[PDB]
PDB file of C-alpha atoms in Angstrom:
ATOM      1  CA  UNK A   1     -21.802 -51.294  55.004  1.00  0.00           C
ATOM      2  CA  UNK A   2     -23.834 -52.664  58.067  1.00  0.00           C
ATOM      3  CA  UNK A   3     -21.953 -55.364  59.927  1.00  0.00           C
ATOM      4  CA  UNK A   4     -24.897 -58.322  59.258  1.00  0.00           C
ATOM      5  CA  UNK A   5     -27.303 -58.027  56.951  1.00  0.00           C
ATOM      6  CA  UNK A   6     -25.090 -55.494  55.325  1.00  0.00           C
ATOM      7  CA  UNK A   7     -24.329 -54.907  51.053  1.00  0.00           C
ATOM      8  CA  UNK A   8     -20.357 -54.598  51.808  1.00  0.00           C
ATOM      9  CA  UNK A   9     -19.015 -57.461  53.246  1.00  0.00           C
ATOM     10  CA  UNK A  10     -20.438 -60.068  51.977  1.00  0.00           C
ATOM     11  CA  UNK A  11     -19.754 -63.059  49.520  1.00  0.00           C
ATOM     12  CA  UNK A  12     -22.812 -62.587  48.048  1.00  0.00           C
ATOM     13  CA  UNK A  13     -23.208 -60.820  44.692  1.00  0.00           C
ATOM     14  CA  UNK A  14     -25.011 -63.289  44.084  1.00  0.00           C
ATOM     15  CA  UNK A  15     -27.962 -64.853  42.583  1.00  0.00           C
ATOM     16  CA  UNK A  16     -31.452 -63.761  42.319  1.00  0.00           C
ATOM     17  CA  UNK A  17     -30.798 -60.987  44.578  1.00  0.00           C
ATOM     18  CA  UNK A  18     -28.485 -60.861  46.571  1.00  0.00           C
ATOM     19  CA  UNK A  19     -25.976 -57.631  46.504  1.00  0.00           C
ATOM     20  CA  UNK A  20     -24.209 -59.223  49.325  1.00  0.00           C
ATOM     21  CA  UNK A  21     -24.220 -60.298  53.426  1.00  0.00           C
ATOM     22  CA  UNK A  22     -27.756 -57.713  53.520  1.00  0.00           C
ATOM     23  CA  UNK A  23     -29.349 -59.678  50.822  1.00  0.00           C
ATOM     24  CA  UNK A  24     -28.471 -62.617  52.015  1.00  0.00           C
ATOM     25  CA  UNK A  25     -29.438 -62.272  55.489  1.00  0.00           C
ATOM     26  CA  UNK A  26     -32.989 -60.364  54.033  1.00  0.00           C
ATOM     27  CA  UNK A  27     -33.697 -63.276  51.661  1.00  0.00           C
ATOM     28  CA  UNK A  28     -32.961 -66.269  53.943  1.00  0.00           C
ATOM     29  CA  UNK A  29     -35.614 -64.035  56.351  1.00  0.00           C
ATOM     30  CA  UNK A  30     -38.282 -64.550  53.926  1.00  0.00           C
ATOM     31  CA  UNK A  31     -38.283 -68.283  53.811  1.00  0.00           C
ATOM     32  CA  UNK A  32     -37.547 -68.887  57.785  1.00  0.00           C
ATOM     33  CA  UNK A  33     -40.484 -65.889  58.142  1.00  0.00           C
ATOM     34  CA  UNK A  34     -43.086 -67.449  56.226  1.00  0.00           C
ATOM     35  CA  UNK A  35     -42.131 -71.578  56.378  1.00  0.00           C
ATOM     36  CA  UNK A  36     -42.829 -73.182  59.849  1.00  0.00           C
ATOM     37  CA  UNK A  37     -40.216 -76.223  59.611  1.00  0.00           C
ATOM     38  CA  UNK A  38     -38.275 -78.609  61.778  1.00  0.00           C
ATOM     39  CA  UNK A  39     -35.871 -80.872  59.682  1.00  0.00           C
ATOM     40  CA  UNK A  40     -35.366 -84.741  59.956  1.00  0.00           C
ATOM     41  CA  UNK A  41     -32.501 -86.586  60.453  1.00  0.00           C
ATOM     42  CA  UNK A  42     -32.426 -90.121  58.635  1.00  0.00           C
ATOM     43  CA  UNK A  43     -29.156 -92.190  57.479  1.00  0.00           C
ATOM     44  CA  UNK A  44     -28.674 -94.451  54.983  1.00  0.00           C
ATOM     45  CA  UNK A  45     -26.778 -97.294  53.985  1.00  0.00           C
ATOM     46  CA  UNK A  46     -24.640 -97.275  50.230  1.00  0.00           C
ATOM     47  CA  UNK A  47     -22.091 -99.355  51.367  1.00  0.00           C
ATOM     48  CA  UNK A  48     -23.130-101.108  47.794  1.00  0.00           C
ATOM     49  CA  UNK A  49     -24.564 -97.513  45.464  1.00  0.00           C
ATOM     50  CA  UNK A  50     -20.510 -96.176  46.762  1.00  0.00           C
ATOM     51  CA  UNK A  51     -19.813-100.259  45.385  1.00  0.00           C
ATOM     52  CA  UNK A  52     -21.619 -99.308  42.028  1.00  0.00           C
ATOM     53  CA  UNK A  53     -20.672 -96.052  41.380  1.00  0.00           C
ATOM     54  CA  UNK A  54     -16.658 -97.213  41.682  1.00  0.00           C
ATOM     55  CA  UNK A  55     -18.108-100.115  39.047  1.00  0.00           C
ATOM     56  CA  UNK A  56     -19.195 -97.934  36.398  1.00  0.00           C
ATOM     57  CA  UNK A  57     -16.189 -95.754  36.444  1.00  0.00           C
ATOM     58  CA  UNK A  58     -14.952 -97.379  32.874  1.00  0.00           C
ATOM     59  CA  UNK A  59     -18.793 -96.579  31.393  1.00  0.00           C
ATOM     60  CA  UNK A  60     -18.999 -92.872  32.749  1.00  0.00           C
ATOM     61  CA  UNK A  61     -15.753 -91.938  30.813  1.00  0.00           C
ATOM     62  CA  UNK A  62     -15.715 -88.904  33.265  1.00  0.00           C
ATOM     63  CA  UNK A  63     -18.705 -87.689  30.310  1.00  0.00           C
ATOM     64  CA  UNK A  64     -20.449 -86.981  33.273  1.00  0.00           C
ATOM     65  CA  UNK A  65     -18.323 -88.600  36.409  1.00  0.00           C
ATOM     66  CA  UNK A  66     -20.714 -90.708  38.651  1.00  0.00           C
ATOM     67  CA  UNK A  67     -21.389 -88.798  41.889  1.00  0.00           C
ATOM     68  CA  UNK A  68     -23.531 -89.456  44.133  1.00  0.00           C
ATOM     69  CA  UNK A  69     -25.598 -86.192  42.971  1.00  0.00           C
ATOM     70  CA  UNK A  70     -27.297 -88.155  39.921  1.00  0.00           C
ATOM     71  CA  UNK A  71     -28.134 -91.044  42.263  1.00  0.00           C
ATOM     72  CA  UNK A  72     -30.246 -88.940  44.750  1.00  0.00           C
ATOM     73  CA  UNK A  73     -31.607 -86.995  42.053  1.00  0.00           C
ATOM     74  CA  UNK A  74     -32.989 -90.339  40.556  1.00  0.00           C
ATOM     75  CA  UNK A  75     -33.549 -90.937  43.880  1.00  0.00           C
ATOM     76  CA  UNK A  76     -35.973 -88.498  45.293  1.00  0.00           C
ATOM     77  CA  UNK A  77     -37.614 -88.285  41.832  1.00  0.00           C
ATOM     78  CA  UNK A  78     -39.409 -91.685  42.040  1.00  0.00           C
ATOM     79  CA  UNK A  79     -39.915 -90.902  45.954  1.00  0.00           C
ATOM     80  CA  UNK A  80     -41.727 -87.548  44.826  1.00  0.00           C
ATOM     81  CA  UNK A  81     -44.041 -89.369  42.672  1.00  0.00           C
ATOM     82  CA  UNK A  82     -45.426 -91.761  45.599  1.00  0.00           C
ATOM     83  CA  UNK A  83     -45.736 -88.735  47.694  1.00  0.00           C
ATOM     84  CA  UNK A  84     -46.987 -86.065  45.781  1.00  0.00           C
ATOM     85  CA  UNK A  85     -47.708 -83.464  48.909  1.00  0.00           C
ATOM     86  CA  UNK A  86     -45.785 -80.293  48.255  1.00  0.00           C
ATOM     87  CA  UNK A  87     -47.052 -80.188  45.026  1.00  0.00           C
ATOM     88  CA  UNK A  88     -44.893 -77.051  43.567  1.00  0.00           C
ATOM     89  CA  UNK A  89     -47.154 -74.116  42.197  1.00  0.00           C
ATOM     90  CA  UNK A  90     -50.609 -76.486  43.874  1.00  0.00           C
ATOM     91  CA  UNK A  91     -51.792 -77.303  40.214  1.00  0.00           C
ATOM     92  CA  UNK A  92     -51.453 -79.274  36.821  1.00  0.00           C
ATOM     93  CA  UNK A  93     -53.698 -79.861  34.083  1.00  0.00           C
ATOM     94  CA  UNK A  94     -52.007 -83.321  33.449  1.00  0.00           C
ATOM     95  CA  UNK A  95     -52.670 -86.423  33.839  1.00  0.00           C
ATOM     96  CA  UNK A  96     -52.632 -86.705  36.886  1.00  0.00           C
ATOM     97  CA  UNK A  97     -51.856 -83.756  38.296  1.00  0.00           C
ATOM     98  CA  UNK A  98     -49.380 -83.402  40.706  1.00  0.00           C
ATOM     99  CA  UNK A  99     -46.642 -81.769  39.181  1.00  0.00           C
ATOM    100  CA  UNK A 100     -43.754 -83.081  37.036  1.00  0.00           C
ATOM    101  CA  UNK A 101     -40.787 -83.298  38.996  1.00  0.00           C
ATOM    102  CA  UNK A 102     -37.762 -80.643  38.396  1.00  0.00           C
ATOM    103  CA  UNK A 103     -35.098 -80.262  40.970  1.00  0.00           C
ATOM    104  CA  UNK A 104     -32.397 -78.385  41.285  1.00  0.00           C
ATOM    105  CA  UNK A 105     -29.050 -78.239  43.079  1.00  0.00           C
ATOM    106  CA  UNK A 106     -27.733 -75.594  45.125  1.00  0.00           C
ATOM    107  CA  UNK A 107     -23.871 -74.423  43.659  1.00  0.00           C
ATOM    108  CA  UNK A 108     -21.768 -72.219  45.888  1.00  0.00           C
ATOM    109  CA  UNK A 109     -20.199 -69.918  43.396  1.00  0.00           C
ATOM    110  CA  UNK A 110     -17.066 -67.131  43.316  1.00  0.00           C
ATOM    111  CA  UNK A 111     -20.613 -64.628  42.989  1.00  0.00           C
ATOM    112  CA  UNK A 112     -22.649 -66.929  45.519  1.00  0.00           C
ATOM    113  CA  UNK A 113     -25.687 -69.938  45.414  1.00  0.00           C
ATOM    114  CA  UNK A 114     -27.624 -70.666  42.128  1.00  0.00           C
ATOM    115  CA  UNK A 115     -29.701 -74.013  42.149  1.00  0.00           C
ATOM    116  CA  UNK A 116     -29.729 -74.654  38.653  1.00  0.00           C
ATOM    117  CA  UNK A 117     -32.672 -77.105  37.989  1.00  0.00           C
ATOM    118  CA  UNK A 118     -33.156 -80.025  35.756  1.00  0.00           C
ATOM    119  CA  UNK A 119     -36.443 -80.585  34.273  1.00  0.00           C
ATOM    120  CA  UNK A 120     -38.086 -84.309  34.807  1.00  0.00           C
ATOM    121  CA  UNK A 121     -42.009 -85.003  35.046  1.00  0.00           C
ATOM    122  CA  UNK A 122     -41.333 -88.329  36.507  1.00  0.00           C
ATOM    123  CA  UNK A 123     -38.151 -89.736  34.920  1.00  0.00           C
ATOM    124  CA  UNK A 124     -34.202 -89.495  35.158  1.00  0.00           C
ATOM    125  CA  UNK A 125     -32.003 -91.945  33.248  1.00  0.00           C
ATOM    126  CA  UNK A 126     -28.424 -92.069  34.378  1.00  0.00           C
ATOM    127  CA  UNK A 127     -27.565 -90.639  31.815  1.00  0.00           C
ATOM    128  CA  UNK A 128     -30.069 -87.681  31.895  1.00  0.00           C
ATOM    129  CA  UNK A 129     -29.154 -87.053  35.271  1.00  0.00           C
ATOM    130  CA  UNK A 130     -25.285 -87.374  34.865  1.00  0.00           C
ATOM    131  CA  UNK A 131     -25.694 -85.262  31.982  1.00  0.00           C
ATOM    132  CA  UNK A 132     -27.255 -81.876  34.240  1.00  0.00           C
ATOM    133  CA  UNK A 133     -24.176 -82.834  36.304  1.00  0.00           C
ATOM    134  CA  UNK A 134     -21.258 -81.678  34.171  1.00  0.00           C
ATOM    135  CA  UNK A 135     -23.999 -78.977  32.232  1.00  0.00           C
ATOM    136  CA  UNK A 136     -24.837 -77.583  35.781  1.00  0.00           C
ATOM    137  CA  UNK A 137     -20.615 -78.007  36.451  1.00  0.00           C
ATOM    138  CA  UNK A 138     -19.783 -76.052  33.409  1.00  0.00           C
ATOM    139  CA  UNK A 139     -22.940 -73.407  33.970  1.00  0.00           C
ATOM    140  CA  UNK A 140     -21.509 -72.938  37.163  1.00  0.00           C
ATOM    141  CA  UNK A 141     -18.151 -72.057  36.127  1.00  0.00           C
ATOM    142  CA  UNK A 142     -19.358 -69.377  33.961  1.00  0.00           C
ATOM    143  CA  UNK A 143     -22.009 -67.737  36.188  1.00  0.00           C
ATOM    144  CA  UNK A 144     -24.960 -68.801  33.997  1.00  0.00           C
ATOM    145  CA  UNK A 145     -26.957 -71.026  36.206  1.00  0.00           C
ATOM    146  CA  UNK A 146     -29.748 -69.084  37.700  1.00  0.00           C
ATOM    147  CA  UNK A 147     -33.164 -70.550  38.751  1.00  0.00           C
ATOM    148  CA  UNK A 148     -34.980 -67.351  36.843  1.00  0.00           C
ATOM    149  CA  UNK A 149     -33.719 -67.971  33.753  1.00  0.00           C
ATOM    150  CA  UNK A 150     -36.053 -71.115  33.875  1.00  0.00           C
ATOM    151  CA  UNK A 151     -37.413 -71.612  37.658  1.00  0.00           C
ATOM    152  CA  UNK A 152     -40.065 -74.077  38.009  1.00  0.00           C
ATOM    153  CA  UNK A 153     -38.819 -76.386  40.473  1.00  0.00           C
ATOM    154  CA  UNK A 154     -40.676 -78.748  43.144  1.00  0.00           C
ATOM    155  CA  UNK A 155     -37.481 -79.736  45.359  1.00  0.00           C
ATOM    156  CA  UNK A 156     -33.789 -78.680  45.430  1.00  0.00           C
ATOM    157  CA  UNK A 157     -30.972 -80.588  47.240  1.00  0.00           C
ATOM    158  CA  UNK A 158     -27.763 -79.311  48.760  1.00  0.00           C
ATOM    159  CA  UNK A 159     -24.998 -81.388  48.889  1.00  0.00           C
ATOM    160  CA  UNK A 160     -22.015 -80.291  51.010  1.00  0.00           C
ATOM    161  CA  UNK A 161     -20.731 -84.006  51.308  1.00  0.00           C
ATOM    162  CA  UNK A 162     -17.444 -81.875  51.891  1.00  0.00           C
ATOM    163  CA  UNK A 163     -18.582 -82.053  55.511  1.00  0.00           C
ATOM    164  CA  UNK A 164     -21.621 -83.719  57.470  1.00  0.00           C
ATOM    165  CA  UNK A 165     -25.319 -83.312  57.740  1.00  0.00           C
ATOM    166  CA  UNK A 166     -27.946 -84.575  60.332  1.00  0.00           C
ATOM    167  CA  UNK A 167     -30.791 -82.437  60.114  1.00  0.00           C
ATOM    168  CA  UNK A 168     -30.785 -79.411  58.817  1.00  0.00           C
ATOM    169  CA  UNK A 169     -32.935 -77.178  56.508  1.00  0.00           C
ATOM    170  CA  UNK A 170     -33.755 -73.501  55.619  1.00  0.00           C
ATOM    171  CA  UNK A 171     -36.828 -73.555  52.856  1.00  0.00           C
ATOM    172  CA  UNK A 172     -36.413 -71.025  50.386  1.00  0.00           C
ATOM    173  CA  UNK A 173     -39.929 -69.909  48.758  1.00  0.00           C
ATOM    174  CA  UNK A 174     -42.876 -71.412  48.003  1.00  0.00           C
ATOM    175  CA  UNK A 175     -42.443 -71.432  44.367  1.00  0.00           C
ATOM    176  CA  UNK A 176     -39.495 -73.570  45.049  1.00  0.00           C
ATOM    177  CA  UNK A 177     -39.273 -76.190  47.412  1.00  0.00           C
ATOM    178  CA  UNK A 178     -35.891 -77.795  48.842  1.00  0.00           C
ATOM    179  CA  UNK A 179     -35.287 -81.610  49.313  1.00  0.00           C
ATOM    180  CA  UNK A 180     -32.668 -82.818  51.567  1.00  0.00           C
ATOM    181  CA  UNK A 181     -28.894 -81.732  52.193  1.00  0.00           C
ATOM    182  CA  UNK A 182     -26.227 -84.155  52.475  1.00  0.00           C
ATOM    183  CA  UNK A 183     -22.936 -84.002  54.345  1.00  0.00           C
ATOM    184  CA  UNK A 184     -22.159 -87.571  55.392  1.00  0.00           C
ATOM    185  CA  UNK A 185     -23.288 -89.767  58.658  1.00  0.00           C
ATOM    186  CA  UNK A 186     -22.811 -93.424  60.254  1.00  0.00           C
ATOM    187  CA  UNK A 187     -25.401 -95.952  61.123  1.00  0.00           C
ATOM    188  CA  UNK A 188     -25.194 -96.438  64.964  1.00  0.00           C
ATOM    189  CA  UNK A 189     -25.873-100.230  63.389  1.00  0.00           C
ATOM    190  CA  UNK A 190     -23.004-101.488  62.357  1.00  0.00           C
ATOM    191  CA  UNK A 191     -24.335-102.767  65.818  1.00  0.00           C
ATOM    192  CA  UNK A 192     -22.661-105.793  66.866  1.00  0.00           C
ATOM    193  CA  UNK A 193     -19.458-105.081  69.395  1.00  0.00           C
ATOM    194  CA  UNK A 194     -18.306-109.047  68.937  1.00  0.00           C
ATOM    195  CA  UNK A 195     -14.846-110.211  67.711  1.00  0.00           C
ATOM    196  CA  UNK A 196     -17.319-112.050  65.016  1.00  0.00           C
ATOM    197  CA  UNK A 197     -19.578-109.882  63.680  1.00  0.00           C
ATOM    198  CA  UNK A 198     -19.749-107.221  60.811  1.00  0.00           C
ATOM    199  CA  UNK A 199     -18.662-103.867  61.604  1.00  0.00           C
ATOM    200  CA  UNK A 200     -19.121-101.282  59.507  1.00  0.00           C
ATOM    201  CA  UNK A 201     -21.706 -99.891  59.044  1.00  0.00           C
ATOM    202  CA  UNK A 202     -21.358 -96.852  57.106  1.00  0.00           C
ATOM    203  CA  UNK A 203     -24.529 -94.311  55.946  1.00  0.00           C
ATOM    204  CA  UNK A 204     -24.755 -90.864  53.857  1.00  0.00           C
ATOM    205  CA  UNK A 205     -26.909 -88.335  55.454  1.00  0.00           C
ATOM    206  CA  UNK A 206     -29.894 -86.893  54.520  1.00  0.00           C
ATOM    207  CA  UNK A 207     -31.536 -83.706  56.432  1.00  0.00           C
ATOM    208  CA  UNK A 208     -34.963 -82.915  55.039  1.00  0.00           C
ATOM    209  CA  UNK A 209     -36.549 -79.620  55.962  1.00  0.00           C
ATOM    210  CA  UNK A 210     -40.605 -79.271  55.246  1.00  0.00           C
ATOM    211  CA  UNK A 211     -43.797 -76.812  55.419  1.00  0.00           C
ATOM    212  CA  UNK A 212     -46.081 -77.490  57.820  1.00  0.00           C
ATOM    213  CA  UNK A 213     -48.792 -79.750  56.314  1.00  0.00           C
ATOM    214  CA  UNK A 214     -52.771 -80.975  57.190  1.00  0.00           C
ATOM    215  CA  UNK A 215     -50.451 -84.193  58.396  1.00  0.00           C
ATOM    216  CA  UNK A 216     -47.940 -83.791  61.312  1.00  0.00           C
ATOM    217  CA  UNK A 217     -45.052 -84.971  62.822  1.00  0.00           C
ATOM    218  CA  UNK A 218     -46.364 -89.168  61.953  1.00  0.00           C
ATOM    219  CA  UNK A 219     -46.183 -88.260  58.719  1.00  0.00           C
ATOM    220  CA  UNK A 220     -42.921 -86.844  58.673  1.00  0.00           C
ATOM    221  CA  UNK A 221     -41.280 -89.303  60.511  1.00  0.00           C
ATOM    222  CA  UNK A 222     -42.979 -91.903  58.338  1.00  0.00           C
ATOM    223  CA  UNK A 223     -41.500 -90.411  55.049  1.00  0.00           C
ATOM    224  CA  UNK A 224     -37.846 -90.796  56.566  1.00  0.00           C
ATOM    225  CA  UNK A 225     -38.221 -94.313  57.694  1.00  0.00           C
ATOM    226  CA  UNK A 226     -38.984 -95.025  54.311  1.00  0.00           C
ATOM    227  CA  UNK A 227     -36.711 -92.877  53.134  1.00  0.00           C
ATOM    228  CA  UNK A 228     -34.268 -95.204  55.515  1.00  0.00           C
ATOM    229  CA  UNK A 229     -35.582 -98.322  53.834  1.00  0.00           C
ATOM    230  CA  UNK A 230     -35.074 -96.914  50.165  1.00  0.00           C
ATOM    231  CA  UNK A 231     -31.466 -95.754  50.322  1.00  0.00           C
ATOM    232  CA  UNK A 232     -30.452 -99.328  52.409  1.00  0.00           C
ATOM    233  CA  UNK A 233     -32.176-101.222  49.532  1.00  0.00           C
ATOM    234  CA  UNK A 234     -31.605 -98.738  46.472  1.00  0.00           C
ATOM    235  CA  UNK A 235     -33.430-101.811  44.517  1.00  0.00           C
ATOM    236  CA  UNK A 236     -36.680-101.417  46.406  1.00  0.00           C
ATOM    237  CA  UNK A 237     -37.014 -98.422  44.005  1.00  0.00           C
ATOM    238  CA  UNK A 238     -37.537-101.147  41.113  1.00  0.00           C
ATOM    239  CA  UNK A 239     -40.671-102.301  42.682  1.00  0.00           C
TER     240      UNK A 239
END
């Protein structure tokens, strides 16, 4: 079939849609076509979440092996909650409105993507979250994680830690909304240069894509330098 955006070659089969490189190319059209975005670049420091997670290696058992997946979920779920815009599907009859908080994960499979998503109103345990992580493994290995099969999701993350990220996006549709990639990244502070002085200073990456809102470009940058602040002080979330 047709060199790009073409059903034979293609590793694609593949998810809602999908016969192959066509599909692909077709469906990734439809979110860039109708979702006006530009996504931000923010780093974070875990120089002490990378700390905990080695910590709790003896308590996971490997029932659901810490990775850092669990941790963002936790962490953009509280982060959705102060900043309800977005709101997946507009409505919600309670409480309080907004609307829960289910996310899923995007999961590169033999067939292709699925984003399997994990339910959550406006909580995720550890052990809640690190126990989507081997159910979404396992799924995932047997081809039966699909979003359809149970959609309703307000924000999806795709981590590719396997590599780098530093702003970077691609919305899908608006039924389901997509959170941040990750990929790695370094603050430019472990500033210092001295023979005496820390250095460091390590960072994950986070590259948010987003619709075009009432708000802006303040807004946006605004929700990354807190996003900064969160990830450098994980406990801030507490408060």
């Amino acid at each position: 079939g047709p060199g790009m955006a073409p059903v034979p070659t293609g590793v694609f089969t593949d998810i809602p849609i999908s016969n192959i490189r066509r599909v692909i190319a077709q469906r990734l059209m439809q979110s860039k076509q109708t979702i006006p975005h530009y996504y931000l670049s923010i780093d974070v420091n875990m120089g002490e979440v990378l700390l905990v997670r080695k910590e709790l290696n003896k308590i996971l058992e490997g029932r659901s092996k810490i990775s850092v997946n669990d941790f963002i979920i936790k962490a953009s779920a509280l982060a959705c909650l102060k900043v309800p815009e977005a709101n997946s599907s507009w409505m919600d009859t309670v409480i309080r409105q907004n609307h829960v908080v289910d996310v899923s994960v995007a999961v590169s499979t033999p067939a292709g993507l699925i984003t399997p998503i994990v339910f959550n109103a406006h909580i995720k345990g550890v052990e809640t979250i690190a126990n989507d992580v081997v159910s979404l493994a396992t799924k995932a290995r047997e081809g039966k994680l699909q979003p359809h099969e149970f959609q309703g999701g307000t924000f999806t993350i795709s981590n590719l830690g396997m590599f780098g990220i530093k702003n970077f996006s691609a919305i899908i549709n608006p039924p389901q909304a997509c959170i941040l990639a990750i990929g790695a990244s370094e603050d430019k502070l472990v500033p210092a240069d001295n023979e005496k002085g820390f250095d460091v200073a390590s960072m994950m990456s986070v590259t948010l894509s987003c619709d075009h809102r009432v708000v802006d470009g303040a807004v946006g940058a605004q929700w990354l330098a807190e996003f900064r602040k969160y990830l450098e002080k994980p406990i801030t979330m507490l408060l």
